[PDB]
Structures are given as structure tokens and as C-alpha cells.
Amino acid sequence: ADDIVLKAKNGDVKFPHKAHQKAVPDCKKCHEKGPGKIEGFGKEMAHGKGCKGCHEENKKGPTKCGECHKK
Ligand code: HEC
Ligand code: HEC
Ligand code: HEC
Ligand SMILES: C[C@H](CCC(=O)O)[C@H]1CC[C@H]2[C@@H]3CC[C@@H]4C[C@H](O)CC[C@]4(C)[C@H]3C[C@H](O)[C@]12C
Numbered sequence: 001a002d003d004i005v006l007k008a009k010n011g012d013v014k015f016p017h018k019a020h021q022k023a024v025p026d027c028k029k030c031h032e033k034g035p036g037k038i039e040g041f042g043k044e045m046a047h048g049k050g051c052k053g054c055h056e057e058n059k060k061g062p063t064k065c066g067e068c069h070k071k
Helices: 017-023 043-047 053-059
Strands: 004-006 012-015
Touching: 043 053
Parallel strands: none
Antiparallel strands: 004 012
């Protein structure tokens, strides 16, 4: 399947799946989550545990604005 881009107004955010599969071998961090996770995602999640927060705990991955958002 293809990578996805979240169409944030301030700049497109790429989600590269292969990097994540490799770096977070614990698949259950993202997969087999209960119902509602598609409807639940948004700016709060992205800037929290949905993207940024995981990067911060793992000590690797983009945490600055321009590292996620790119026109
Ligand atoms: C969040 C950070 C994820 C982690 C960790 C893993 N997966 Fe994932 N997966 C995630 C998304 C948002 C999507 C759809 C968007 C995309 O970029 O593809 C997927 C997709 C898959 C698929 C289908 C395509 C593919 O992987 O080749 C599979 C089979 C899949 N995910 C499995 C998988 C496994 C086995 C993981 C751990 C080793 C894993 N993913 C991590 C989000 C995230
Ligand atoms: C843990 C459960 C994560 C979640 C949820 C998200 N990301 Fe992530 N990401 C994670 C790690 C440990 C890393 C380092 C991987 C590396 O090889 O550097 C990453 C990396 C990225 C990257 C950069 C990929 C690269 O090739 O350097 C991007 C662009 C990225 N992550 C974006 C991203 C987004 C947009 C997420 C939410 C949709 C997201 N990540 C979630 C761990 C985790
Ligand atoms: C990845 C780890 C990110 C970092 C670091 C920052 N942002 Fe972000 N942001 C990210 C995603 C994946 C999304 C979209 C959520 C979704 O609904 O899919 C966003 C959202 C925003 C928004 C709102 C955009 C919109 O509603 O169209 C803004 C204004 C925004 N982000 C700005 C922003 C700034 C200023 C950041 C640095 C301080 C920043 N983001 C970090 C992913 C990530
Ligand atoms: C559930 C995980 C991990 C974060 C968490 O614990 O909630 C999060 C991390 C990345 C999230 C996906 C990012 C891309 C998509 C954003 C969409 O607007 C809603 C569906 C997708 C497919 C999201 C679904 C789900 O919300 C995921 C896979």
C-alpha cells in the first residue's frame, strides 16, 4: 500500500510506513487498536501521542514544525 499524506493547511505531513515498521516493531502501538481510531485522529493526537509524543519518548523522529510539515 502507499504512504499517506495528511493535508494540514500549514504544510503536508508525510507518513512513511516502512520507517515505522522498521523502527517500531511492536505493531500494536498502531494496529489492532479499538474502534474509533480513524475518527479520533486530529491535530491534538498528531501533536500528542499520535505522532509527536511517540517521537519524543523514543528519542528519535521529527519533533519540530518543519520536520513534519512541508509545502
Ligand atoms: C504507526 C506508527 C504504525 C506502526 C508502528 C506500524 N504501522 Fe502498519 N500502518 C500504519 C498506517 C497508518 C498504515 C496505512 C498507511 C500507510 O502508510 O500504509 C499502515 C499500513 C500497514 C500495512 C499495509 C501495507 C504494508 O504494511 O505494507 C501493513 C501490512 C501494516 N501496516 C503492518 C504493520 C506491521 C506488521 C507493523 C509492525 C511491525 C506495523 N505495521 C507498524 C501505521 C503503523
Ligand atoms: C510510535 C508509536 C510512533 C508513532 C505513533 C509515530 N511515529 Fe513517526 N517515527 C517513530 C520512530 C521511532 C521514528 C524514527 C525512525 C527513523 O528511521 O528515523 C519515526 C520516524 C518518522 C519520520 C521520519 C522517517 C525517516 O525516514 O526519517 C516521519 C516523517 C514520521 N515519523 C512521521 C510521523 C507521523 C506524521 C506520525 C503520525 C501520523 C508518526 N510519525 C507517528 C515512531 C512513531
Ligand atoms: C509530527 C510529529 C508533527 C509535528 C512535529 C508538528 N505537527 Fe502539526 N500536525 C501534524 C499532523 C500529522 C497534523 C494533521 C492532523 C490531522 O488532522 O490529520 C498537524 C496539524 C497541524 C495544524 C492544523 C492543520 C489543519 O487543521 O489543517 C497546525 C496549524 C500545525 N499542525 C502546526 C504545527 C506547528 C506550528 C508545529 C511546531 C510547533 C507542528 N505543527 C508540529 C504533525 C506534526
Ligand atoms: C492509533 C495510532 C497510534 C496513536 C494512538 O495511540 O492513538 C494512530 C497513529 C497514526 C494514526 C493514523 C495516521 C494516518 C491516518 C489519519 C486519519 O485522520 C485517520 C486514520 C489514520 C490511518 C490514523 C489512524 C490511527 O489514529 C493511527 C494509526
